[PDB]
Amino acid sequence: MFEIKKICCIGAGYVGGPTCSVIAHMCPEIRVTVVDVNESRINAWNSPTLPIYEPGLKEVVESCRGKNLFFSTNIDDAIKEADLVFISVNTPTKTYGMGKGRAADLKYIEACARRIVQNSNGYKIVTEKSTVPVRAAESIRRIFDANTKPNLNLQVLSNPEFLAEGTAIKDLKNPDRVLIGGDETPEGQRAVQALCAVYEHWVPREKILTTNTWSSELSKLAANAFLAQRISSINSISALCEATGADVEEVATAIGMDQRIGNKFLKASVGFGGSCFQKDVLNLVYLCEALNLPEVARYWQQVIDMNDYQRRRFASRIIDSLFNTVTDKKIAILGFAFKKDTGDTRESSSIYISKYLMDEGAHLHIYDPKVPREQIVVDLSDQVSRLVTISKDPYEACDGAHAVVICTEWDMFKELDYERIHKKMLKPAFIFDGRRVLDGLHNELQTIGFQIETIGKKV
Amino acid sequence: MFEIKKICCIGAGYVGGPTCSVIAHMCPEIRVTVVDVNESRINAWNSPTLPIYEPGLKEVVESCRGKNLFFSTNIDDAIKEADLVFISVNTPTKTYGMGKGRAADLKYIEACARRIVQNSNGYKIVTEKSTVPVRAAESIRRIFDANTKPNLNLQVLSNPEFLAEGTAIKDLKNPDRVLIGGDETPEGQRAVQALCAVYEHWVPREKILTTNTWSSELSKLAANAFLAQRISSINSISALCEATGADVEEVATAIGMDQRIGNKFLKASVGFGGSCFQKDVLNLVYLCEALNLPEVARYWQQVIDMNDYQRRRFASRIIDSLFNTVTDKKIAILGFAFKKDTGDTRESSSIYISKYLMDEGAHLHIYDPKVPREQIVVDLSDQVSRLVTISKDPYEACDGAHAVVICTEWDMFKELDYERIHKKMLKPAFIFDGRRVLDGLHNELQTIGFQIETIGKKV
Amino acid sequence: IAILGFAFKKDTGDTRESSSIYISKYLMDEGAHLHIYDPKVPREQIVVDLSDQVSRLVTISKDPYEACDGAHAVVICTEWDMFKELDYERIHKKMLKPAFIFDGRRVLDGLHNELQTIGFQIETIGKKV
Numbered sequence A, B: 001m002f003e004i005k006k007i008c009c010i011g012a013g014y015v016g017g018p019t020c021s022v023i024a025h026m027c028p029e030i031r032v033t034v035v036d037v038n039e040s041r042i043n044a045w046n047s048p049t050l051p052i053y054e055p056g057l058k059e060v061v062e063s064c065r066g067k068n069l070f071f072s073t074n075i076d077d078a079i080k081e082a083d084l085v086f087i088s089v090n091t092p093t094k095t096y097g098m099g100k101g102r103a104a105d106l107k108y109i110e111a112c113a114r115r116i117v118q119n120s121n122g123y124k125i126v127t128e129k130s131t132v133p134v135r136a137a138e139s140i141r142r143i144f145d146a147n148t149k150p151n152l153n154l155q156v157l158s159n160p161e162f163l164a165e166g167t168a169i170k171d172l173k174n175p176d177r178v179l180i181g182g183d184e185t186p187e188g189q190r191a192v193q194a195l196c197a198v199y200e201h202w203v204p205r206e207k208i209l210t211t212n213t214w215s216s217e218l219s220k221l222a223a224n225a226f227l228a229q230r231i232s233s234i235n236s237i238s239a240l241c242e243a244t245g246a247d248v249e250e251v252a253t254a255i256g257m258d259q260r261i262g263n264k265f266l267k268a269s270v271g272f273g274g275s276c277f278q279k280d281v282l283n284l285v286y287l288c289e290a291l292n293l294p295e296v297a298r299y300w301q302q303v304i305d306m307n308d309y310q311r312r313r314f315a316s317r318i319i320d321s322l323f324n325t326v327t328d329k330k331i332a333i334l335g336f337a338f339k340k341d342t343g344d345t346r347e348s349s350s351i352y353i354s355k356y357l358m359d360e361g362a363h364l365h366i367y368d369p370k371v372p373r374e375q376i377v378v379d380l381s382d383q384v385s386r387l388v389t390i391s392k393d394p395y396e397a398c399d400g401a402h403a404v405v406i407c408t409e410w411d412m413f414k415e416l417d418y419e420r421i422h423k424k425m426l427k428p429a430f431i432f433d434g435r436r437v438l439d440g441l442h443n444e445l446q447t448i449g450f451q452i453e454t455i456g457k458k459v
Numbered sequence C: 001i002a003i004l005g006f007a008f009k010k011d012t013g014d015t016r017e018s019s020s021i022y023i024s025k026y027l028m029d030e031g032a033h034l035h036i037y038d039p040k041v042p043r044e045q046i047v048v049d050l051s052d053q054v055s056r057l058v059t060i061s062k063d064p065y066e067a068c069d070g071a072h073a074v075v076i077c078t079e080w081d082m083f084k085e086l087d088y089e090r091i092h093k094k095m096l097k098p099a100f101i102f103d104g105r106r107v108l109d110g111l112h113n114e115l116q117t118i119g120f121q122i123e124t125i126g127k128k129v
């Protein structure tokens, strides 16, 4: 019966932007307009310097911008003439009220739903696409159900996004699965079927899963948690390794070869970050508490607690090696993004390690090859003026530093000329490898004269 | 240049038996003698009725018993003339003292190590092969180090077993990996190398991992924990599903298609059993406490707690549907083994569900197509005489039963003639599917007139 | 396991609150077969002090050498001067290996190398580990 010719996506961020760019590149006969309230963000999408760093994104966007892909601040007209409307906005964590610091704030999703009613007539498909959807489908539906025009027929779908930042293009093109939730009604099926059509342009039919909206959202919450759990589990083992002279990377390989366990996501680290994982577990915990499932609640909470412990442990290892005093000591922080190949800092372990060292009065010199320097400044908030310097390049940061702390797995960090760094560092020269990037360069670094300490090997 | 011609394995159980049988079948030029103190177990190994049920085991044993595979009670002479000695004995959980209910008792491992010293001269390789090795290598080594003859040279290796009961043959032949731990010394490497040689007869060289003994044992502890954790995680989700009208199997598929998560071991169930998992986690927890890592300890403990909760919940679901009273009510228990395709009941969720129902005064009629009936009796201990009947076949068990409770995923349970059962059950007729075996037969069973309740779903 | 010394200090027969009672009970909860020697504590007192579980695990030794015969470890709880004197080569020959001495009183200070030469694994309060 129905074919999607015009698509509108509200929210031009790390989800909405790339996911739409790819849709446009795969569906040249579809008009894709991505809208936002943030003007300078949209402007940047239209510039040759994109607002987010993501490998292969400049290439995908340029290939079809001004053709079938558009970025505009004109939300109203895009919703008005669109067949499908994506909601890909952020649901920040509530800072006050019940759920403070824990439950997600649906205020922006709601604002979108309202603004869609006000600007729509006829048939439209409204699809919620977030990285961690929390009761989102249901809250849109209740706004639509109450603000009913005649001849207005709005279908609500859930379509969670599985992309991982830094590899968004690769992931969007060859996704592991696509998950679409819709109502179990005649009208619901037709809307689901229509969205599959979009995806079927480049995704195999048996890689597309269709279900009801709630089962869809729950799947994503759980999926995210399982992922987060693996990192926390291996990090836990990393503490055990340091305590008993084993090596987590080795133990990891051995764990990983069980085809029932899989060998991905066992890379122990200073702790997981990003806007997905921590927020997702917290919401799952909160949900369980509200449903009167305290046993489940406290089970998943452990993922967060382990992660917190992982960070705090690594921090006090640095503070220890410096004889529990770092007042007016130059420390280099290499890497601020929550992972490699992005500029995103949301929830980066870097932020936390940094703050711990700041509470010790360390003079921090921070370098990251892609994170905007204003962003580093915002993230560490006064006390910032006295202690923080954003370095132009890594060598400035390490010049006269007592210690070098690696927090993000940027490939460029294996490359640095380490003899040069050692010459101009204060002795004893410490490298703290929170990412396991300097594995294999181990002897060399000791030969040069480094005292070299890494996560999950030899406390 | 060393070559292993004679092998002796102390312990002829679910580990030692099958793992040696397969060694003999793959290495026809090696003499493999499996010894035990239990006489009627050895006798049964030599009979046409083997002491343990395991698919394909009869075929493997018969093909090379008397030719190169021997089962004998004569421990002393087997040790005396062997090049390699396996220790594959049980380490039961301490019932008293520090570690009560938690830490493993190394008493039998020690008895073996002593008995080996007393019966050995020259060069021998001693290899510890257990399903969950706890400080086993180290304890053997301290006995050998102190009881030193001249010309006696005993090498200690760790070689954890990854097989899963019910698929031991398939697993032993195509293992995911083989893990060997030996000392990082000239003498150590030679012994490790010698053991690889045995395995290289049928296992690709790049599927064999070599390391130090401790790193090896820790790997197995961790690996086992990760496995157990998946089951508990999905089980936790199953409670969430039941509370919100989603379906865990569906959710599971969606989680499972993430190639980073893998799709194995997401089969929600009434709770994991067997002699590996619970015992492994407890020892890991205990080890962490002792190493002053409480944060890690309490992280892994959650796996056990969730599992306990999973069982308790399912139990009181049955008691609930029967209006909180089961005094003098006939309930059929289908399945008693901890999993399908074995006779083993060690830690079977069936034991626990059964006891919960016994404390309610239920008359239980238990059927399992492979569990010896004496074993069921031992496992439920007096109160047994008054309440328990071991049924000859499933239909006896369901005759006049208020409810049928499925605890083990035996394939034969989908086959049963369910109209027949429903005719002779008291109404309302309840089926409780703790294994998800009756998925797909859902309407049929409702048509027939069953009230059908299953894990991860709601009525 | 051999327990040498049961009196709460040397040169008395008094056991009231002796650390020996406590060490012994901890080792009993582990199911150790205890052979207890004290040159001045009435045998009956030892029996009262460890209270059934006593019958199965406790033996009051006539002299120290009986106690250490076939023992895995020797535990010294009371600073009786006579304990420095014992013929330790004799004890080690008839102990199960590895032979442990646990010096809870610091009486074997100075005899340290000798005991290691003989082949003991020797651990004491306040040293090493």
Ligand SMILES: NC(=O)C1=CN([C@@H]2O[C@H](COP(=O)(O)OP(=O)(O)OC[C@H]3O[C@@H](n4cnc5c(N)ncnc54)[C@H](O)[C@@H]3O)[C@@H](O)[C@H]2O)C=CC1
Residues within 6 Å of the ligand: A010, A011, A012, A013, A014, A015, A016, A035, A036, A037, A038, A041, A075, A088, A089, A090, A091, A092, A093, A108, A109, A111, A112, A129, A130, A131, A132, A133, A275, A276, A279
């Ligand atoms: N914002 C936060 O602090 C957090 C958000 N999350 C979640 O994780 C996922 C990440 O999504 P991103 O694309 O990375 O977020 P984002 O913040 O990078 O991009 C969202 C864009 O939506 C725009 N927007 C918000 N409300 C709007 C409205 N009412 N009308 C028009 N535009 C609007 C914002 O201005 C922003 O440019 C989200 O889908 C959300 O589920 C999780 C934790 C924290």
Ligand SMILES: NC(=O)C1=CN([C@@H]2O[C@H](COP(=O)(O)OP(=O)(O)OC[C@H]3O[C@@H](n4cnc5c(N)ncnc54)[C@H](O)[C@@H]3O)[C@@H](O)[C@H]2O)C=CC1
Residues within 6 Å of the ligand: B010, B011, B012, B013, B014, B015, B016, B035, B036, B037, B038, B041, B075, B088, B089, B090, B091, B092, B093, B108, B109, B111, B112, B129, B130, B131, B132, B133, B275, B276, B279
């Ligand atoms: N038995 C229990 O209750 C528990 C055992 N475990 C663990 O499960 C793992 C799997 O091993 P299985 O083959 O399933 O156990 P098993 O008990 O089925 O086989 C071990 C065999 O070793 C024999 N044996 C024991 N001590 C011996 C000795 N000192 N000398 C000679 N023979 C001796 C026993 O007679 C027994 O038949 C074990 O390696 C152990 O780590 C964990 C928790 C509980």
Ligand SMILES: O=c1ccn([C@@H]2O[C@H](COP(=O)(O)OP(=O)(O)O[C@H]3OC[C@@H](O)[C@H](O)[C@H]3O)[C@@H](O)[C@H]2O)c(=O)[nH]1
Residues within 6 Å of the ligand: A131, A161, A162, A163, A164, A165, A166, A224, A227, A231, A264, A265, A266, A267, A268, A269, A270, A271, A272, A273, A274, A275, A276, A277, A338, A339, A340
């Ligand atoms: O093995 C690992 C993997 C990841 N991490 C760290 O944990 C964080 C997780 O980042 P991811 O690589 O999972 O990617 P993202 O956080 O950008 O996206 C993640 O949530 C959004 C979902 O769409 C993706 O399915 C999920 O992977 C990063 O800091 C990463 O470096 C580890 O410390 N160890």
Ligand SMILES: O=c1ccn([C@@H]2O[C@H](COP(=O)(O)OP(=O)(O)O[C@H]3OC[C@@H](O)[C@H](O)[C@H]3O)[C@@H](O)[C@H]2O)c(=O)[nH]1
Residues within 6 Å of the ligand: B131, B161, B162, B163, B164, B165, B224, B227, B231, B264, B265, B266, B267, B268, B269, B270, B271, B272, B273, B274, B275, B276, B277, B338, B339, B340
């Ligand atoms: O999805 C699952 C998988 C497994 N399980 C349960 O977990 C228990 C053990 O299952 P397994 O397949 O692991 O059988 P085992 O316990 O004998 O083997 C396990 O322990 C020993 C190790 O060598 C093996 O690698 C490990 O699989 C059973 O109760 C099984 O039903 C689930 O409940 N759900």
